[PDB]
Symmetry: C2
Subunit: 437 residues, 2 copies
C-alpha cells in the first residue's frame, strides 16, 4: 500500500507517520535520520607540491674556447661566462689568465616527497548524496542505507520504501576547489596553462606519472664574482611553502549549515538543508485488523502543564471508557504539536498520560486515537528561560490559536469596533433610502 | 601580440588566419584540426550479467519430520514435501509410505564469466572535449594538443595560443547509457532498487566484487511427480541473453553528426558541430618587416574559366610591376570565395596564378596582397555534373553579389518600375501645389 510523506532533512529528529487505511487497525511509523552524506564529483585538473633547484658542478676548461649546448628538459639557462680567474685552496689552479670559460646550468625537479606532501586541485559537478535511515514500527526496528536519489529501493523487510528527489542542492562546494591533507578550500587557483611566478602553483605537473613538469619559477643567473668559483642564481621562494605559512580559514569552519567535511572520499556530513520525500508500500499482513482493541467510546482530555520549548513540556492526561485491553495507536493531526510516544497499551482504568512540545502559547492540537479523535487546548503559559545545548522537538513556526483562550479579547474588541461602524452604516443606508423617497 | 579568431569545427579543412600588424610585413597562419574527441563523465550505477540457478542435490529422509530452515542467500524457495515414493536403478529404497520427507532448495548466483562478459551502465553529464590542432607559418609547421577548454595555453614555440570554449555542448550522449563490448546505446534502464522479472537487468549487482547480488527472477517450486526423484523448478529465461539476441539499432549509426564512438575511455570522435574561438600572442621576431620586398605598385585581376563548387576551379591571373623579387603574403578579406595558396614566391615578371573556389556564380571576393588590395569579380557561371566523394573546401554561403553581372537587369527594371510611380508622385505633387492656391 503506497503512501507519500515528507521529512525535514535534519539529523537526530524523530518523525511520525500514521497510516489511515481502513479495514485494519491504524498504526504509525517511526523515522530516524542518522548521518547523511554528500559525495561530489572530482576531476583532478592538476597537482602541485614543493620543488628543488637542481644544479650540477660548474665546468672550467683552460683553453678559452666557447662551448654552448642546450637540452630539452625544462627551464634551462644556457649561459657561458669568460674572463674568469678562479681561486682554490692551492692558491689557484691552471695558469692561463683572461682565457677561461665557465658553463653553469641548472633546472628544477619535483620534491622527494611529491607522493606524500602534495596538494591537489579538483573540479566540482552536480553531486549525489547518500543517507542512513532507521525505520521502526510495530515489532520492527532496523536501519538501512539508500541513495535518496530520484528513485531507489530499500527492501527493509516485508515492506518496501522509496526516496524522492532532493528539493535543492545548496552544496558548500562550487566550481573548482583544492584539497591538502584532510582539509579543503574554495581557492580560485590559476589554470594549467600559465602560472604566476611565486603566488601558487609554481610547478603545474600532472599525476605522479612524471612527464612534462611545467614550471614558471624563472631562474636568473649572473657572472660569478672574481673571488672564487660560484654558481650565482636567483630563485623565488616556494609558493607552496608560502601557501602553507598563510593557509588560514580552513573551509571546515565555513560550512553554511554546519556541514562537517571529511576528506578521504571528499564528502560532507550532517547538515540540514531542505526536506526529503518518501513513498512507502506495506503488505496488508503486517499488522492486525480492527477486531482488536476498540477502546474509544466517548473521549475527553485534561491539560496540566506546558513547560515547553526545550524538549517536551506538554504533559496531558486522557480518560475514556475502554473495552478489553490491547495495542492502540495515537498521534496528533496538526503539525503545531508533536507527541513523543507511538502506540501505547491501555489498562482498564482509562487514564493514560502523554507528552508533547510546541512553541505556541495557545496550542490547538488534534489528538487522534486508533479509532476516535478529539480536540484539546492548553493555556501554555510557562515561558522558559535557558540556553540549552540539546536539539528542538517542534516546528519553527509559532502562532496563537485564533480561537484560543488569551487573545480572544483582542479579536472581539476589533470585531466590535468594526461592527459599530457596520451597524451605523446600515442605519445610514436605511435613513438615506427613507429620505430619498 | 594578442589577436582573436574563429575556426569552424570541420575536420580536414585548412583555415587561413591573417595578421596585419603595422611596422612589419603582414603574415598568414595555416590552421588544421585533426580528430576532435568529446569525453563524458561516468558514474557506474550498477552491473548486469547472466545468472546461474544453483540447486543442491535433493535431501531424502524416511521419518516424516520436516526441517525447514532459512538462510540469507537471495530468493530462496523454502519448501519441503511429504508423500514421496522415489525410484532409482535398483527399483526403490526403504519401505515406509505416506511418511517420508523430500527437501528441495535452490537459489541464484552470478555468472562464471562475470569478470569479462558483463554489461556496464553509466550516467552522463557535462562533457569536456579535446582537439588536436596543427599550426603553420613561415618555415614552421607543427602539431599541437590542447584541451580547448575555457582557458588553456598551447606554447607551440615562439608564439602562444589559447583555444576558447565551445559555444554549446551538443553531446550525442544523454543521461544514462550502456557500454558492452565496443558499442553504446541510448536505452534507459530500471534503477538499482527494483527490476522487472525478465525484461532486462533481472540481476542488478553492483561493482564486480560480488556483494549483494539482488535478484527478482521469481523462482518457483513444484511437487515432484510420483515416478522417480525430481527437482521441478520453473524459471524465466535470462534477460541478458535475450537483450543480446534482440540488440539491434546500435548507437554508432545514430550519431546526429556522424561522430564515431570508441569505447576504451568511451569518447566520440571526428564530428562537426559549432565553432571554436581562439586567441594568440606572437613574438616580434617571428617574421619580416616592411622593408623586405615591397613590390605591389598597381594591381588588376583577370579570370579565364571559373567552373566552381567542387574543389578549386577559380584560376586567376594577377599582374603588377615588381621591385626586387621576394616573398609576400596574399589572402582575401571576404569569405564569399576562399583560396588555397599560402604565402607565395614572386618573380620579377609579376604574372601570378591563383587558385580559389566559391559557390555563387558572381563572386565579389576582394583579394589582398601583403601591401595592396583590389576588387576582383568573375562570372563563374558553369557548374559541373558530378557527385563528388571528397570534401567541400568553401563556405556554404551562396548569394549573388549586389553589383553582379547577370542579376543587374533585375535591379534596373525594379528601379525603373519604382521610377514610374516616383515621377507620378512628383507630377501629382506639382498639380496639388498648383491647385492648393
Ligand atoms: C530501536 O533499536 C535501537 C538499537 O538498535 C534502540 O536504541 C532504539 O531504542 C529502538 N527503538 C525503539 C522504539 O525501541
Ligand atoms: C607540414 O609538414 C607535413 C609533413 O609532416 C606536410 O605533409 C604538410 O604539407 C606540411 N604543411 C604544409 C602547410 O605544407
Amino acid at each position: 500500500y503506497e503512501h507519500t510523506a515528507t521529512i525535514p532533512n535534519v539529523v537526530g529528529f524523530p518523525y511520525k507517520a500514521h497510516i489511515e487505511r481502513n479495514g485494519f487497525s491504524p498504526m504509525t511509523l517511526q523515522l530516524e535520520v542518522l548521518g547523511t552524506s554528500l559525495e561530489p564529483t572530482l576531476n583532478l585538473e592538476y597537482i602541485t607540491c614543493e620543488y628543488k633547484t637542481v644544479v650540477p658542478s660548474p665546468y672550467i676548461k683552460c683553453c678559452g674556447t666557447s662551448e654552448c649546448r642546450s637540452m630539452e628538459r625544462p627551464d634551462y639557462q644556457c649561459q657561458v661566462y669568460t674572463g674568469v680567474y678562479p681561486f682554490m685552496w692551492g692558491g689557484a689552479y691552471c695558469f692561463c689568465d683572461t682565457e677561461n670559460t665557465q658553463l653553469s646550468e641548472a633546472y628544477v625537479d619535483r620534491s622527494d616527497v611529491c607522493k606524500h606532501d602534495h596538494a591537489a586541485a579538483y573540479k566540482a559537478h552536480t553531486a549525489a548524496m547518500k543517507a542512513t535511515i532507521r525505520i521502526s514500527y510495530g515489532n520492527l526496528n532496523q536501519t538501512t542505507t539508500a541513495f535518496v536519489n530520484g528513485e531507489h529501493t530499500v527492501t527493509v523487510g516485508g515492506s518496501r520504501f522509496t526516496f524522492g528527489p532532493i528539493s535543492t542542492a545548496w552544496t558548500p562546494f562550487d566550481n573548482k576547489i583544492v584539497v591538502y591533507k584532510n582539509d579543503v578550500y574554495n581557492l580560485d587557483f590559476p589554470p594549467y596553462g600559465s602560472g604566476q611566478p611565486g603566488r601558487f602553483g609554481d610547478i603545474q605537473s600532472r599525476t605522479v606519472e612524471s612527464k612534462d613538469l611545467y614550471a614558471n619559477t624563472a631562474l636568473k643567473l649572473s657572472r660569478p664574482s672574481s673571488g672564487t668559483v660560484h654558481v650565482p642564481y636567483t630563485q623565488t621562494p616556494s609558493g607552496f611553502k608560502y601557501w602553507i605559512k598563510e593557509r588560514g580559514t580552513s573551509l571546515n569552519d565555513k560550512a553554511p549549515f554546519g556541514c562537517v567535511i571529511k576528506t578521504n572520499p571528499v564528502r560532507a556530513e550532517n547538515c540540514a538543508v531542505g526536506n526529503i520525500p518518501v513513498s512507502m508500500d506495506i503488505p496488508d499482513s503486517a499488522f492486525t485488523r480492527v477486531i482488536d482493541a476498540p477502546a474509544v467510546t466517548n473521549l475527553e482530555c485534561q491539560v496540566a502543564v506546558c513547560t515547553h520549548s526545550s524538549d517536551f513540556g506538554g504533559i496531558a492526561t486522557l480518560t475514556f471508557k475502554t473495552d478489553k485491553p490491547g495495542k492502540c495507536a495515537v498521534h496528533s493531526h496538526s503539525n503545531v504539536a508533536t507527541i513523543q510516544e507511538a502506540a501505547v497499551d491501555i489498562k482498564t482504568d482509562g487514564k493514560i498520560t502523554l507528552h508533547f512540545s510546541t512553541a505556541s502559547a495557545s496550542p490547538a492540537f488534534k489528538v487522534s486515537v486508533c479509532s476516535a479523535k478529539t480536540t484539546c487546548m492548553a493555556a501554555c503559559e510557562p515561558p522558559k528561560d535557558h540556553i540549552v545545548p540539546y536539539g528542538a522537538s517542534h516546528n519553527n513556526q509559532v502562532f496563537p490559536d485564533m480561537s484560543g483562550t488569551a487573545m480572544t479579547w483582542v479579536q472581539r474588541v476589533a470585531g466590535g469596533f468594526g461592527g459599530l461602524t457596520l451597524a451605523a452604516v446600515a442605519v445610514l443606508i436605511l435613513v438615506t433610502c427613507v429620505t430619498m423617497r
